[PDB]
Design a protein around this ligand. Structure first.
Ligand SMILES: [Mg+2]
Ligand SMILES: [Mg+2]
Ligand SMILES: [Mg+2]
Ligand SMILES: [Mg+2]
Ligand SMILES: [Mg+2]
Ligand SMILES: [Mg+2]
Ligand SMILES: [Mg+2]
Ligand SMILES: [Mg+2]
Ligand SMILES: [Mg+2]
Ligand SMILES: [Mg+2]
Ligand SMILES: [Mg+2]
Ligand SMILES: [Mg+2]
Ligand SMILES: [Mg+2]
Ligand SMILES: [Mg+2]
Ligand SMILES: [Mg+2]
Ligand SMILES: [Mg+2]
Ligand SMILES: [Mg+2]
Ligand SMILES: [Mg+2]
Ligand SMILES: [Mg+2]
Ligand SMILES: [Mg+2]
Ligand SMILES: [Mg+2]
Ligand SMILES: [Mg+2]
Ligand SMILES: [Mg+2]
Ligand SMILES: [Mg+2]
Ligand SMILES: [Mg+2]
Ligand SMILES: [Mg+2]
Ligand SMILES: [Mg+2]
Ligand SMILES: [Mg+2]
Ligand SMILES: [Mg+2]
Ligand SMILES: [Mg+2]
Ligand SMILES: [Mg+2]
Ligand SMILES: [Mg+2]
Lengths: 191, 197, 172, 136, 193
RNA sequence: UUUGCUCCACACAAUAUAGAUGGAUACGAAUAAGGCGUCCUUGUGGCGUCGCUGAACCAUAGCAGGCUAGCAACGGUGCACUUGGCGGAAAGGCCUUGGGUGCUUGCUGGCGAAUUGCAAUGUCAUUUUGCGUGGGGAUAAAUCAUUUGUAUACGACUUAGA
RNA sequence: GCAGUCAAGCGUUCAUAGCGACAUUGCUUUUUGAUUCUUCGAUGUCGGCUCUUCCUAUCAUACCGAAGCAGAAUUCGGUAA
RNA sequence: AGAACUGGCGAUGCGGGAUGAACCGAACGUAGAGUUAAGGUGCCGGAAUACACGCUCAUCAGACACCACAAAAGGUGUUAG
RNA sequence: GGCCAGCAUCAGUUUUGGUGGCAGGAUAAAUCCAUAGGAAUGUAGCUUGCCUCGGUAAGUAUUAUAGCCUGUG
């Protein structure tokens, strides 16, 4: 029924200055700098004080208002991702064949290379996205760890690998072989 | 109003550009349209992709040559929207169609000539903000138009020279506004004011 | 049915030697002219008493003008409207400056949301909502907040000639 | 490193927003938004300009960037007392917008003779300015 | 793609010159005689066209011709053709082309051994051919009146037009074909016993 | 085959014309944002300002725009030249230098205009062609027939021939 | 002839994995009927051969989601001509 | 396929429904000016890319009587009750 | 006076403007003025609690340093 004004706060922390002209957003914190293009969403940002920003929708419909929060959230994860950072934890599972995962390169590359999945002679290669680093985690068995500033770039490089490992032609309950996302969290600790 | 009218295609809705372009030629107004690859159709890319494929399957069964002809170039996608609005099998219609040229990009002579805009076809003026739309160049390269990259290459070069041009021009009308300032407060200037100028 | 007027319409029940001076019933009727309003009056009286226009008489017809035509008022409305599958009562709220303006956009609303042509709707009651927070419907409540303001973003200016030499600006 | 977020600063529908009527009996008269009926209609009063108190569709009027303290729902006299007190007119009179309106209103009244004089003058202004444009 | 210039060598063999004529024996053989005069003055415009290529010219091809007198054939008319230069740097391509005017290029600089190559050529012609051999159509039965190398049904009743797909007696052969993946087993030399 | 062809120059002659009648007057990009001016720390920066339509801008006076004088300016513009530079998307057009020369309504003068009779588009554009003249420039091919057979029903194709 | 909806039942247990009564809503025009509009101064019957093209309510092949899918096999379904 | 009352077509053009015996409008001497009907006014194409309030976004949207078809049954799409 | 026009004054038909005088009605309804009461999307003041020296907020508070609403004339 056309809501005349509804808004959302975007909080800003001590090490971060976010700069939005047109709807292009830049966020620069301690961990790096990220940029994301909101031109498609039709909302008004407002600075208030250096730690606070509002996003508003005037005379919106449901679908329009419903995209307000997902703008707030989308910038937040740029803010936390530039302060704390994002770390996605994955842990292999196989019931017979030991899935064997390395990091490989051709022409600057950085691919994730999965061998012997369910005994496959086939070699799966997921590429490493930019701004995301993969470190096989010492002290825990069959763990890969993807870290970076961009949630969407890590969580995607996460699910990219989990999906190279899908199983065909077998009951996929009884055959659980794969690489799955075991934990989602930040980089900086105590949090 | 003017012998030839050059229309920047960029930012216009195809059927509402075609609609006014059609009536202008029928009234004897020459028109050339530039940058037809920056033309817009309402609705998301997929819709007008399917819509083009519906068009694409119509052909004469016994000989696909006599059948409907499918032109992939954004200008020709436009010239088809236009021709349907002109009775093009009359002599009067062929007449009017000949006052038309449609172009991808802004080739010579038209580049240094001024191009104008059609507010009742302007996409940003008509579509409700938040509707989804299509760009002709995307759609055409989808259906086999070969030349999107070459056009975009040439354009971005042409676009850079025209910025040199403009830069000089804004720098010359800086002086013209300066010399216009000394003349202000004089008798000539004060009298012209009263007369509206 | 048109731009509306409101009509006090008074009619009675033709006199008989055995029953002179019958009972005199009034209705307020929204109509575009006084000919519809009288037809409309008789339409409802035959729905309530035993009378028809033949056996009865219209005693008087008077237009009622809005008492405070420049004061913004919150109206609750009460409507009975036939739909395709069955008939239903309703209550809507309308914010406007006159009962006549109110009835106008009611009928417009019933046509747009519920596809109800003029023949289907009955106006049951229209009355001024006196205290606020007797406003019960959220699309009106929106407009009663203190120190209300809104922008009108993406302004579109009607062009007076087929060509423009600038490029529009929706700024405002 | 400050934050630096834009503005996108709009003229606003609100009490005391002065508004230039475009179509109808008034049409070019200023007037003020008194109360606010919905997203489209508003209640306006023009007393110094002559415009009657009325509801009006917003698209029939353009918002000026001019404002003054007015009580919501203020009646006509109140509107008039506050409007003069705020010096609305000379404020609008002084704006480039209204100067442009007044300018083309003059150009429209020009007698053919005056038209011939505007020409002779522009010829002279052109002579000394095109000169000034070669001396630095 | 559009060609914006052709720079030619100064001297031009009678083998190539013969290709520019339908009747050589009668003709004055005036071909390219005003063009050779462009070399006379200091080189001049020959440079500016060559120069224009380098400035512009997304692509460079080289005109070559066969030496057909070096062949057993009877026909003296040589074969001229364009061959795209794929070696680097548009400015280096025309440089290479300029350097080779009137000079000779040999096969061993194009094809090595065991190379997969394609052959473009015009198929041997058979002229007018019945529907049977031309399309590989089933011979009709022996009892059939009015002849058996044919197609029984030229089409259904509707569409009531015989159709572009149906096989029909026509020309056979003399077609352009691009045939690929032909390995080079030997690259010979003429001066070699 | 009766002195032909071509480019430039003007001339007479024709034949046209989908429709001259002051000027098609060049950024780009965004539109829930921008243009411009200014400043600096050269930025997604500070500050100022503008829009709300080209209703503008430029041009516009002079026999359809005649013949003439002068002053103030040193500016404007037309023309043919000459210096240097740019443009290949269909560049075939844009800029710059320097002399010459015409006009200038920037301002002030002398003369002319009638009878085209109270209106009658009152003829001022640009198409192609042809015919002489003389200012540059150039002196071929194709087809038939004959011939090959890498071709072919006939045409066509492919060869060869001072 | 093909396809739904309700879901009593079937399926060791379990309405809907796969099925489905009593009902009921439809689609299709390679069934057969009903009709008698066109053709009786004539539109050459059945089938096969030959050849083309189209439909999809997909038999196979591509990639998928279900399963009363351990594997193997199969079944149901989707995008698909 | 067969009756009833009226009105039509047949025997009839004209405007409209693109098209069409029967629908809508209106019935015809030859013409001029005006006004209309049914139906229309983005362009085809004469005539508002008129004004106003809502609704609708469809990976086979929808678009005006007769009329050139769609149903049960469903939707945490959205709207108003 | 052969043909054709132009203008002027008129006649018939018609189209499109400007403008003057009146009649109705709740003898329009409003605004406006007077007056009586009133409330809140509560104006001034006052209180209170944080708060960069006054601004906020939540309380009182019905004209005060804004105003509105309703009746009657
Ligand atoms: Mg499976
Ligand atoms: Mg299996
Ligand atoms: Mg060249
Ligand atoms: Mg044979
Ligand atoms: Mg064979
Ligand atoms: Mg036989
Ligand atoms: Mg056969
Ligand atoms: Mg800068
Ligand atoms: Mg700035
Ligand atoms: Mg010069
Ligand atoms: Mg002059
Ligand atoms: Mg079960
Ligand atoms: Mg059981
Ligand atoms: Mg059971
Ligand atoms: Mg028969
Ligand atoms: Mg017959
Ligand atoms: Mg026969
Ligand atoms: Mg037959
Ligand atoms: Mg089970
Ligand atoms: Mg009838
Ligand atoms: Mg009969
Ligand atoms: Mg009849
Ligand atoms: Mg009739
Ligand atoms: Mg129809
Ligand atoms: Mg009809
Ligand atoms: Mg009827
Ligand atoms: Mg058409
Ligand atoms: Mg029209
Ligand atoms: Mg309908
Ligand atoms: Mg109906
Ligand atoms: Mg629903
Ligand atoms: Mg008269």
């Amino acid at each position: 029924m056309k809501y005349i004004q509804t808004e959302q706060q975007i909080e800003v922390p001590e090490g971060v200055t976010v700069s939005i002209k047109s709807r292009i957003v830049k966020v620069v914190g301690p961990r790096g700098t990220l940029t994301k293009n909101l031109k498609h969403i039709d909302v008004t940002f407002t600075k208030v004080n250096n730690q606070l920003i509002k996003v508003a929708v005037h005379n919106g419909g449901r679908k329009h208002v419903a995209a307000l929060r997902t703008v707030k959230s989308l910038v937040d994860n740029m803010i936390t991702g530039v302060t704390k950072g994002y770390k996605y934890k994955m842990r292999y599972v196989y019931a017979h064949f030991p899935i064997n995962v390395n990091i490989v390169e051709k022409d600057g590359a950085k691919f994730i290379e999965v061998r012997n999945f369910l005994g496959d002679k086939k070699i799966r290669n997921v590429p490493v996205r930019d701004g995301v680093t993969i470190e096989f985690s010492t002290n825990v068995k069959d763990e890969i760890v993807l870290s970076g500033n961009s949630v969407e770039d890590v969580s995607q490089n996460a699910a990219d690998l989990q999906q190279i490992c899908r199983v065909r032609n077998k009951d996929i309950r009884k055959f659980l072989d794969g690489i799955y996302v075991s934990h989602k969290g930040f980089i900086t600790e105590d949090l | 109003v003017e012998p030839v009218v050059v229309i920047d295609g960029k930012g216009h809705l195809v059927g509402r550009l075609a609609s006014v372009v059609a009536k202008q030629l029928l009234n004897g107004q020459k028109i050339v349209v530039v940058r037809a690859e920056e033309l817009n159709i309402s609705g998301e890319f997929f819709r007008n992709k399917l819509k083009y494929h519906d068009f694409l399957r119509k052909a004469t069964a016994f000989n696909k040559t006599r059948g409907p002809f499918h032109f992939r170039a954004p200008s020709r996608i436009f010239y088809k929207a236009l021709r349907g609005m002109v009775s093009h099998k009359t002599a009067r219609g062929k007449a009017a169609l000949e006052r038309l040229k449609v172009f991808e990009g802004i080739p010579p002579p038209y580049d240094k000539k001024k191009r104008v805009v059609v507010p009742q076809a302007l996409r940003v003026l008509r579509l409700k903000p938040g509707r989804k739309y299509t760009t002709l160049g995307k759609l055409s390269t989808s259906v086999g138009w070969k030349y999107e990259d070459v056009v975009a290459k040439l354009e971005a070069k042409r676009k850079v020279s025209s910025a040199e041009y403009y830069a000089k021009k804004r720098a010359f009308t800086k002086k013209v506004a300066s010399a216009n300032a000394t003349a202000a407060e004089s008798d000539v200037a004060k009298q012209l004011a009263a007369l509206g100028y | 049915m048109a731009h509306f007027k409101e009509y006090q319409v008074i009619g009675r029940r033709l006199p008989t030697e055995s029953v002179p001076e019958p009972k005199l019933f009034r209705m307020r009727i929204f109509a575009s002219n006084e000919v519809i309003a009288k037809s409309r009056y008789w339409y409802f009286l035959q729905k309530l008493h035993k009378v028809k226009k033949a056996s009865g008489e219209i005693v008087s017809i008077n237009q009622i003008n809005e008492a405070h035509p420049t004061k913004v008022k919150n109206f609750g409305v009460w409507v009975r409207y036939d739909s395709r599958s069955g008939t239903h009562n309703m209550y809507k709220e309308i914010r406007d400056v006159s009962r006549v303006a109110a009835v106008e956009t009611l009928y417009q609303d019933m046509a747009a949301r519920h596809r109800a042509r003029f023949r289907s709707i009955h106006i049951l009651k229209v009355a001024e909502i006196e205290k606020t927070a007797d406003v019960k419907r959220q699309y009106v409540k929106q407009f009663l907040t203190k120190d209300l303001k809104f922008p009108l973003p993406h302004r579109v200016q009607k062009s007076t000639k087929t060509f423009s030499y600038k490029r529009p600006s929706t700024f405002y | 490193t400050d934050s630096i977020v834009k503005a996108s600063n709009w003229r606003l529908v609100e009490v005391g927003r002065v508004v230039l009527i475009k179509k109808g009996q008034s049409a070019g008269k200023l007037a003020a938004i008194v109360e606010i009926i919905d997203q489209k209609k508003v209640l306006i009063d023009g007393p110094k300009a002559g415009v009657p108190r009325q509801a009006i569709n917003l698209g029939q009027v353009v918002l000026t960037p001019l404002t003054f303290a007015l009580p919501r729902g203020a009646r006509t006299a109140t509107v008039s007392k506050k409007w003069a007190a705020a010096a609305v007119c000379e404020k609008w009179a002084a704006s480039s917008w209204a100067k442009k309106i007044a300018q083309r209103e003059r150009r429209a009244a020009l007698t053919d003779f005056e038209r011939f004089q505007v020409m002779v003058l522009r010829k002279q202004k052109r002579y000394t300015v095109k000169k000034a444009l070669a001396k630095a | 793609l559009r060609s914006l210039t052709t720079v030619w060598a100064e001297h031009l063999s009678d083998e190539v010159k013969r290709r520019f004529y339908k009747n050589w024996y009668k003709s004055k053989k005036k071909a390219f005689t005003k063009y050779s005069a462009k070399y006379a003055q200091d080189g001049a415009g020959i440079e500016r066209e060559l120069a224009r290529i380098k400035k512009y010219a997304s692509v460079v091809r080289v005109l070559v011709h066969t030496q057909i007198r070096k062949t057993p054939l009877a026909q003296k008319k040589a074969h001229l053709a364009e061959i795209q230069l794929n070696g680097g740097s548009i400015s280096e391509k025309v440089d290479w082309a300029r350097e080779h005017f009137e000079k000779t290029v040999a096969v061993d600089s194009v094809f090595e051994q065991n190379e997969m190559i394609d052959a473009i050529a015009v198929t041997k012609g058979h002229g007018f051919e019945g529907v049977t051999h031309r399309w590989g159509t089933k011979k009709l039965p022996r009892k059939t009146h009015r002849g058996l190398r044919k197609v029984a049904c030229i089409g259904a009743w509707h569409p009531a037009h015989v159709m572009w797909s149906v096989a029909r007696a026509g020309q056979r052969g003399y077609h352009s074909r691009t045939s690929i993946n032909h390995k080079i087993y030997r690259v010979g030399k003429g001066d070699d016993e």
